[PDB]
From a paper:
IL-23 is a heterodimeric cytokine comprised of p19 and p40 subunits and plays a key role in establishing autoimmune diseases such as psoriasis, arthritis, inflammatory bowel disease, and colitis. IL-23 and IL-12 share a common subunit, p40, therefore library selection against IL-12 should remove the p40 binders. IL-23R interacted strongly to wild-type and most of ala-mutants, except for clones with alanine mutation at residues 137, 141, and 145 of p19. These residues, in particular W137, have previously shown to be major sites for receptor binding.
Residue numbers in the entry:
A (entry chain A): 8 to 34, 46 to 117, 136 to 168
B (entry chain B): 0 to 14, 19 to 29, 38 to 69, 77 to 98, 103 to 158, 164 to 260, 263 to 280, 283 to 305
C (entry chain C): 4 to 18
The structure:
């Protein structure tokens, strides 16, 4: 099975990194979500965790490609001291362990969405470490 | 135009020119015996609240959805910007509560409907809106539950809350959109104990997860903030995933909770004096 | 927008 605690440590770090990249509280789905039937719930994890992890991997690869795209590598350019840079590296790191300007509004949408995805994945790996 | 709200109840939308309304009998208004018209149907020019009410042939309620300067009326509910509905969830069960405020005491009716998504909406069952508090201002509250909830999933369609507000002959409606995860506020930590350590100022603080919080805790984890604070306003905060911490007691300890993996709302503080 | 410590896990690690 995967390195549960290393995934636990990394997925948790993704949560704090996704937070710092967008520390904003409040309130056409073109990203993969960890849906109800992707088997990432406590029961689905015991029964068959490989299914859940193949979904986490799909989503991780997806956000890597979004973060390395013109949305983030375009005007207005990111600061060098950016959490988004760290965040891109971390998504790649976890996926490897598994095996009015338009661009501004898009970053917010993707990072807010990313925050929801990484929170479920972080919970998966924390439970996995504690029970597998 | 006009539309049905409930059987024999109609909403007349208006912006004095007035809207012509044709009332078909299956005529007098409210209490009065004064006959206002002859014929199976009745043409009324609805321009004001006086031209509204229960019209009866020899049986039919008309409520108004007024519009001043091209913007629907929002008088019934007071703004808690343009936030008339406030919603919260204690966990990820699909169960939530919504609250609103008013200055009105009587002849008030609230209908509450909810769903997940707008196109092919998934069922959410709401209960009755009931008066829950009075302050020196009336507070009403409703409890909704997602029919086929999935606590662990990453929500992509928001829950939609719709509240019909009727004060006498004034009709208004309110709406709220949210993901459960965005309206999460855990209950406070429970059984907050303090253990003084022999010949020392440090105490072992211990508490438990709240009873209403999502299970298992090993999956739905919380982060706790342990705080030591004196009488007058330093900040002595510690953050932990453990259900205990050791702190320095002088001559108050507070603990609050937030979801460990997503920055939702902080809980109310649980406290114990030093 | 909030302070980074607003997210307790962030504060636990980086505060
Ligand atoms: C909230 O109020 C609006 C405005 O009165 C309602 O919109 C009308 O609804 C009827 C029935 O669905 C339609 O035939 C009309 O075309 C709508 N009017 C406009 C101006 O579009 C709306 O239905 C209400 N919402 C709820 C939850 O009842």
């Amino acid at each position: 099975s995967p390195a549960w605690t290393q995934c636990q440590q990394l997925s948790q770090k993704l949560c704090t990194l996704a937070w710092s990249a967008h520390p904003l509280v409040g309130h056409t789905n073109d990203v993969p979500h960890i849906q109800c039937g992707d088997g990432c719930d406590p029961q689905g994890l015991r029964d068959n965790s490989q299914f859940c992890l193949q979904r986490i991997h799909q989503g991780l690869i997806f956000y890597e490609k979004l973060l390395g795209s013109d949305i983030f590598t375009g005007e207005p350019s990111l600061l060098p001291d950016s959490p988004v840079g760290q965040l891109h590296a971390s998504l790649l790191g976890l996926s490897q362990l598994l095996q009015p300007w338009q661009r501004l509004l898009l970053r917010f949408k993707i990072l807010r969405s990313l925050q929801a995805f990484v929170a479920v994945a972080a919970r998966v790996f924390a439970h996995g470490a504690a029970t597998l | 135009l006009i539309w049905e709200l409930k059987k024999d109840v109609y909403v007349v939308e208006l912006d004095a020119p007035g809207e012509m309304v044709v009332l078909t009998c299956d005529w007098t208004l409210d209490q009065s015996s004064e006959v206002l018209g002859s014929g199976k149907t009745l043409t009324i020019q609805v321009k004001e609240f006086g031209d509204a009410g229960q019209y009866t042939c020899h049986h039919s309620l008309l409520l108004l959805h007024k519009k001043e300067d091209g913007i629907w009326s929002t008088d019934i509910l007071k703004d808690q910007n343009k936030t008339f509905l406030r919603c919260e969830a204690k966990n990820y069960s699909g169960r939530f509560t919504c609250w609103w405020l008013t200055t009105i005491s009587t002849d008030l009716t609230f209908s509450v409907k909810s769903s997940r998504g707008s196109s092919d909406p998934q069922g959410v069952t709401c209960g009755a809106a009931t008066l829950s508090a009075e302050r020196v201002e009336y507070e009403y509250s409703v409890e909704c539950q997602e029919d086929s909830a999935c606590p662990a999933a990453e929500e992509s369609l928001p829950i939609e809350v719709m509240v019909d507000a009727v004060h006498k002959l004034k009709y208004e409606n309110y709406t709220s959109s949210f993901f459960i995860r965005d309206i999460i506020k855990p209950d406070p930590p429970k059984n907050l104990q303090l253990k003084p350590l022999k010949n020392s100022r440090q105490v072992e603080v211990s508490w438990e997860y709240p009873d209403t919080w999502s299970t298992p805790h090993s999956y739905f984890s919380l982060t706790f903030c342990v705080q030591v604070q004196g009488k007058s306003k330093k900040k002595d905060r510690v953050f932990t995933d453990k259900t205990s911490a050791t702190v320095i007691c002088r001559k108050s300890i507070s603990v609050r909770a937030q979801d460990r993996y997503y920055s939702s709302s902080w809980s109310e503080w649980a406290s114990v004096p030093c | 927008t909030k302070s980074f410590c607003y997210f307790g896990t962030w504060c636990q690690m980086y505060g």
